[PDB]
Amino acid sequence: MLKYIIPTIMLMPLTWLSKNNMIWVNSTAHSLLISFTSLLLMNQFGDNSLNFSLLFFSDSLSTPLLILTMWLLPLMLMASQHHLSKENLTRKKLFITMLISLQLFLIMTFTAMELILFYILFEATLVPTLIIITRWGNQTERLNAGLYFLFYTLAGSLPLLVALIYIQNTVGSLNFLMLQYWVQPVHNSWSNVFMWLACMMAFMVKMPLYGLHLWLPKAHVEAPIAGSMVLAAVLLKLGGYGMLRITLILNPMTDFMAYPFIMLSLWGMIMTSSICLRQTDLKSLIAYSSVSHMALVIVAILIQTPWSYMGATALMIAHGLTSSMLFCLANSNYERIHSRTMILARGLQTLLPLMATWWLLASLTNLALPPTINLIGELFVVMSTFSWSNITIILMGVNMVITALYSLYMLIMTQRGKYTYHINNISPSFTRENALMSLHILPLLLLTLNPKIILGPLY
Amino acid sequence: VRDHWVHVLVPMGFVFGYYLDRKNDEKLTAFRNKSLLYKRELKPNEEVTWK
Amino acid sequence: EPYPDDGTGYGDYPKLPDRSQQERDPWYDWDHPDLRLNWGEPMHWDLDMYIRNRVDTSPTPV
Amino acid sequence: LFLITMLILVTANNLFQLFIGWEGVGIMSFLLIGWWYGRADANTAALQAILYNRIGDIGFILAMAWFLTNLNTWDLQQIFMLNPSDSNMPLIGLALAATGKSAQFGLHPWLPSAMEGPTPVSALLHSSTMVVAGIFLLIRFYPLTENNKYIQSITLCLGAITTLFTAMCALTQNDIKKIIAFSTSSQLGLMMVTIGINQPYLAFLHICTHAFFKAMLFMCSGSIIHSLNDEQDIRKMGGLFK
Amino acid sequence: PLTLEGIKDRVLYVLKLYDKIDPEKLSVNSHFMKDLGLDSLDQVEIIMAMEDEFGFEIPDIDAEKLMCPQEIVDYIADKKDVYE
Amino acid sequence: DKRFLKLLRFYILLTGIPVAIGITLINVFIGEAELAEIPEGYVPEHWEYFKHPISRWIARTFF
Amino acid sequence: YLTHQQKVLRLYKRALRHLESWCIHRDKYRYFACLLRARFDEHKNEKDMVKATQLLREAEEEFWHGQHPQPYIFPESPGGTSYERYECYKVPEWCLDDWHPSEKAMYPDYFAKREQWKKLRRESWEREVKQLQEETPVGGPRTEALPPARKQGDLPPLWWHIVTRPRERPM
Amino acid sequence: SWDKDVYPEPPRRTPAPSPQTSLPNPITYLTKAFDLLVDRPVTLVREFIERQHAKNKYYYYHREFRRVPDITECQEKDVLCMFEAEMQWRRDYKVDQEIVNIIQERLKACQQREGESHRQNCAKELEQFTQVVKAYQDRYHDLGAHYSARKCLAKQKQRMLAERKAAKEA
Amino acid sequence: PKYEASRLSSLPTTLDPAEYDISSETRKAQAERLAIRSRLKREYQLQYYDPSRRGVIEDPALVRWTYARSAFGIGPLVFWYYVFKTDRDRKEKLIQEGKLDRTFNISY
Amino acid sequence: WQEDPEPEDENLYEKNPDSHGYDKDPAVDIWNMRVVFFFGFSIVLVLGSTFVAYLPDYRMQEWARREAERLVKYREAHGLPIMESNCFDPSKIQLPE
């Protein structure tokens, strides 16, 4: 993985040694080159994972998440450089450095063989993410958003550390390849019940599980655009990736331990989808939309079927592009009217015809129109949970209806109707913004032609 | 060139990273041509099956 | 008139009549004609439920 | 695009490809019903069509899930070959999906509301594209429904209540486009009745014949409306014979 | 395509088919109350015929103010964007 | 809006057309490999287990 | 807010429109419209205003019972089939400010005339604000009525968004 | 182009034309037009391409995996042996998935091919499909997303113990 | 037959008994309401008509609304828990007994 | 206190009507559009989509099919079951009891 670690590290001297007016050009250009080389990780085999060294490996689960991570860095750079234009040069370079350091931790997190190494990197992502929100958010309550985000995580992550160290003592190793062969069944006991919860609750908070989700809308409303993009697209999936890995060593106890979380997820997805129908902050609506989509991922992971794991992988990738695109669309309006209130600026299709098309496409993928990979992932989960219990189709189907309702409600409210009379600063869409939207949706739709590369190891 | 010398940094980082990935495989050759699956007789001009 | 003092969390936000925006005079020169609101007037707590695309409370002939 | 999504639906040989067309016509109808997007009632009607059709889509995904779980397939060829006898659940799902798509009683109001769209939309929506898709889906599955008396009884009564209720609504409507829309709902109910008496090929013949004169009636109403400067109330027409 | 003269011709044409108005006394400036002796019930019926003549509604708040043919011509011209 | 779509079209076609032409020439003049039994005593290279010339170039160069 | 006279006149118009929805045919409507008018003319000279209010209240109870459930609506009136149909084509005039110079070059005459209006607006604004200050009592406006211009060369205060509003059929 | 034994088709029986009308058959003239205007130019382009292909004949091979000891022969926790056995079991699992896919393709082709007589004439395919699905279900069903040769063996031994008990009670 | 108002169908204004008895106190209140409306209208209009203004006219009423709004918990989880748990216990019991049909079920 | 007033929002189009929205300096703005469009669309999306389209048998699903065809041919030619229930030979298993 050094061919990705080192050039990512070199982005830092590139940014600091660039001419003052070239920092965005150079960092964007070279981060795109790193993203191109990331496609060499597609050398996956049917039986064995791609095991580079004693520290790093890449299977079909981590590879799509790696590609998404390195694709997202140039997009965040493009999305950030406008609202940071007045920032002084050193603080701009520090901002870009946080984004680069976030990529560094993320690609190492997704490729670590040993689970303590994954833990340290998994925890290290907190620092630049917290700094990005509290330093470069606009509003007063970004400070509280940082503390909620920080302490929700550490409330779950410290028990995980204790469990991980306990598991190594008992088993002798935390190398994930070793765990596949030395794994032993988890028998029933109160000790194993708390081992299970310690192994899982940290990832539940990240997803976030319904009932542990209130940090997320708080974080999004305060974060700058790049913060929301990485948070929605990658940082949530750290918990999804963590669960997909650690469930290996939790059988058969997951059989009955999953129930309360499945109930929270299955009911939570309806609750959060309904909440979206009444949200007045556009960013908060997209944040609640993520909670609803990630509830499906949690169910998929917990029921542990080949179909559910494939759906979970596709849903995680598909949501990452879709939700990141929606924050970018929401942010493009915000950079004109300086408000996140959804009802403030209406009828924008009359004023911004092509941005209306991007809104339309983002909404269509959000409601999982066939054959977008959004639907492929959702459909696979719906398929698998029906076998788990046929009654789940009722909650799955109802959630589909509500998702279509709030997705299109977003579109109708902001883009259709009459334009607000007094808002007279809706300038034409910039090339940067149109490129940013298209750099989300085009790869997302191209993945329809070859979905297999996002379906994960169970494919 | 003082104008564009910084544009070799990430490309050089990739070459160095590629080279170090290859050197690490040289430390993991304990089973080269020894797995039951792939073990064979060396070809006449072959020193090692992979490198 | 505020909402009744409970833990519900309305604070001092006024309790306004539970009527749809469809019931407002369509001929009056509203600052927001699509919503039938004037700039500065207090908005119903459930305005987003009472827009013309959603819940209608208009009198019915039956 | 609306025509293309329909031809995907009609030529589909597996349920996933059919679902692509199913949802495609749904979203194209959303875009065309809400053509005049500055009008709140147009946006409301467009979203209403999405709402009712996604309720019927619950049936579609149920049938997809049953067929995969129990028959290991989404291909029509394998489903008909395995010929399940306990087909109550998959067919109830298909009937629900047909009820939304073909505006049968219960999920019926969206079809008359769809008159918000420009008249050519109504002509194509009601004749050769969206609304007959629900009927077409059930005709595609006659190898299963012809062996299920319980499913036949359900579709029979659903069509009967539909054909009578919507024809009764049409008796008093004053908007010319709504009278024709309720005529389509009633004609759809008759098609559902034909499915209920185990006459799938007759139901299919009515789809074809209906397309010609229903699309003509809309085009004639559009001719009148255009000549009367967008008047659609029949109480303000009259004396147009010559 | 409406014209200021075209609108005026049709407004007076309608009024000249109203038995309570004598077509000889009618001009564009005739007040419906002071010159023609009509009442406010009559005025409501005149506005209704204008709505029927041109096929659009004049809201009650505006209609009550239109007391002569010229004010109707002005009102119709303003809502239809007729400048000639 | 029109300028963006022209730029998008130009930069997609800037390499798209050369790649589309390159694929056609490779298919026409090099063509695909033909399946054969492994000759007795022959050890194929790992990239000789793939049929399309671009695929076996990818396997040879990068994988 | 509405006078008694306004309420009676509103009811008469509303009653006549619903009666037409029922009658449909013009000859039938003419007959029943005259009968309806005679019901209003009967109590035209009622000077007891408590009795007059009773007459109107019963009349409105009668109207609610006898109204058409699907009355005729003019196509572009609120609730009609063409209401707001053309809003999507209405584009505010400030949007032209953002036109690219090559787009503006396609209409040199139009954009020179637009500059004169923008100059007229800029030079008038201070006098409009001043006129409104002088004519507004201490408490502020008590009604929404706006005044005319009082001198020569003055424009009626707050005219721009009335005068330059989109055409009803803008495209 | 493919093995006719793997993907069999019965011999085809096409009736000869037997016109009972003096009117010309439009399909016959469209068929001749299609041959002249579509097939021949298409065939000419293809023959040029194949001529280029014959100048550069090169081969690819189907990879052969030697057999290695199964998980049954692996000492507990001996990852070097377990690894090779696990990889072999995973390759076999993918192969068995494609064996089922072949049999399902046979069944579906027969259903379409036999038309309104499929229910009777596709019985042999239906039976073969029924058996392979049962064998496939026994091997791999209910293992879960974290499947392994170990879990697969545990299932077989559970099945073998249930079969030994039932035979004993008989 | 009198009108019965409902939550989703209001009393018509022409049928409302308080619309025909308007006293001096009621008229005074209406004037006070019109005065508040007119004052806000002028404040809005002086900005909306200002030729030099480019941007958004911030509405404190809108801000108060979003601020106020941005400021049945185990029962359904328990209910759904017993629905799915009861269903899966029943299903598991039948599979162990062989009484559930899974003849062609090889996708999960 | 003593504090600066809030700056007024700036429209990039007023000074540069040809702005791509990347930078106030037109030369930098044009360069930044070019790298994004070239490295984003011309390289990663176009060449990356081509690279993915031609991956050498991603995860052996083509090899598996060929191998399945070889085994189905062999087993049917020798009167063997297409597939056996048992994944592992019973002879190599010692059951408990």
Ligand SMILES: CCCCCCCCCCCCO[C@@H]1O[C@H](CO)[C@@H](O[C@H]2O[C@H](CO)[C@@H](O)[C@H](O)[C@H]2O)[C@H](O)[C@H]1O
């Ligand atoms: C002996 C062990 C220590 C090994 C140290 C090896 C590195 C030594 C570097 C010495 C040269 C430092 O160079 C000095 O700092 C920076 C970047 O270089 C330059 O100035 C910089 O200003 C801005 C950034 O703020 C940019 O335009 C650009 O990065 C550069 O011009 C100075 O003009 C140069 O005088």
Ligand SMILES: CCCCCCCCCCCCO[C@@H]1O[C@H](CO)[C@@H](O[C@H]2O[C@H](CO)[C@@H](O)[C@H](O)[C@H]2O)[C@H](O)[C@H]1O
């Ligand atoms: C959101 C959080 C969700 C939390 C979900 C909580 C699930 C609770 C699971 C309860 C079962 C716990 O595990 C249970 O522990 C006891 C320990 O005494 C074990 O039982 C053991 O102790 C008891 C003593 O009472 C003995 O009778 C028994 O012989 C012995 O084996 C059980 O074999 C095991 O089933």
Ligand SMILES: CCCCCCCCCCCCO[C@@H]1O[C@H](CO)[C@@H](O[C@H]2O[C@H](CO)[C@@H](O)[C@H](O)[C@H]2O)[C@H](O)[C@H]1O
């Ligand atoms: C291995 C892959 C590496 C890919 C890296 C891609 C980075 C692309 C960045 C391009 C940005 C170029 O931006 C700018 O263009 C020209 C280059 O002559 C120069 O601009 C100007 O510089 C001096 C004069 O001042 C002249 O020599 C030059 O002719 C002139 O154009 C700037 O010095 C450079 O900063």
Ligand SMILES: CCCCCCCCCCCCO[C@@H]1O[C@H](CO)[C@@H](O[C@H]2O[C@H](CO)[C@@H](O)[C@H](O)[C@H]2O)[C@H](O)[C@H]1O
């Ligand atoms: C569309 C642009 C895509 C750019 C990326 C692809 C660039 C390179 C693509 C084609 C490279 C040439 O393709 C290559 O040609 C020869 C066939 O002549 C093959 O080579 C094989 O046959 C040739 C003889 O013909 C001999 O060297 C030998 O028998 C064997 O190695 C390679 O296995 C094939 O991969």
Ligand SMILES: CCCCCCCCCCCCO[C@@H]1O[C@H](CO)[C@@H](O[C@H]2O[C@H](CO)[C@@H](O)[C@H](O)[C@H]2O)[C@H](O)[C@H]1O
């Ligand atoms: C999505 C595309 C991303 C593109 C990113 C571009 C990064 C640049 C990577 C260049 C790597 C070239 O690396 C070099 O290629 C040659 C190809 O002859 C390989 O050459 C070797 O390949 C195999 C290895 O068993 C054998 O055929 C033989 O040993 C030799 O030919 C070398 O093993 C490799 O060191």
